[PDB]
């Protein structure tokens, strides 16, 4: 699809405001994907033996791990549509290395909307969710053609 400049704008802003604090916007949203959809949390052999939030809130590789998911994401979403190049090695690693289905994309994109919600509820009207929830279709559908050419679902 395409994403009209308005949106973008939109979007790029409360990135702005999310980028203030990477590490603590990382782990909010990978803990809310694993209390949310606990399955996902099988696909890391690295935190599958986090058991309680607490557990998870105190790994520092979890905090890591959501600093190199918001890194890669921010770059995708800083390109404006033009992330081919982005794409490749992220769809690669996603379906070979391990393989992740299209629904645990949509799983964490609504644990992104989630906590922008919460933290950013001012530069997060209808509006500007739309957006987001534009921009993250978008990335998951260029993801899925990518999965199907590299021998996977998609
Ligand atoms: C916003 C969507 C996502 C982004 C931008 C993202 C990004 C990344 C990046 C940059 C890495 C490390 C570098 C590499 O690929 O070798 C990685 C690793 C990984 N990701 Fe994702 N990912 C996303 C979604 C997911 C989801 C939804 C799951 C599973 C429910 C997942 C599972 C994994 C696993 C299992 C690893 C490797 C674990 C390890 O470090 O040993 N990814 N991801």
């Given at each position: 699809m395409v994403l009209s400049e308005g949106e973008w704008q939109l979007v790029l802003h409360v990135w702005a405001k999310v980028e203030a604090d990477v590490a603590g916007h990382g782990?909010?949203?990978?803990?809310?994907?694993?209390?949310?959809?606990?399955?996902?949390?099988?696909?890391?052999?690295?935190?599958?033996?986090?058991?309680?939030?607490?557990?998870?809130?105190?790994?520092?590789?979890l905090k890591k791990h959501g600093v190199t998911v918001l890194?890669?994401?921010?770059?995708?979403?800083?390109?404006?549509?033009?992330?081919?190049?982005?794409?490749?090695?992220?769809?690669?690693?996603?379906?070979?290395?391990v393989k992740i289905p299209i629904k645990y994309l949509e799983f964490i994109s609504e644990a992104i909307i989630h906590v922008l919600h919460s933290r950013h509820p001012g530069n997060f009207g209808a509006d500007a969710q739309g957006a987001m929830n534009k921009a993250l279709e978008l990335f998951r559908k260029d993801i899925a053609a990518k999965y199907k050419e590299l021998g996977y679902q998609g």
């Open positions: 782990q909010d949203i990978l803990i809310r994907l694993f209390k949310s959809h606990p399955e996902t949390l099988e696909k890391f052999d690295r935190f599958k033996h986090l058991k309680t939030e607490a557990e998870m809130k105190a790994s520092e590789d890194t890669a994401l921010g770059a995708i979403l800083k390109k404006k549509g033009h992330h081919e190049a982005e794409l490749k090695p992220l769809a690669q690693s996603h379906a070979t290395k």
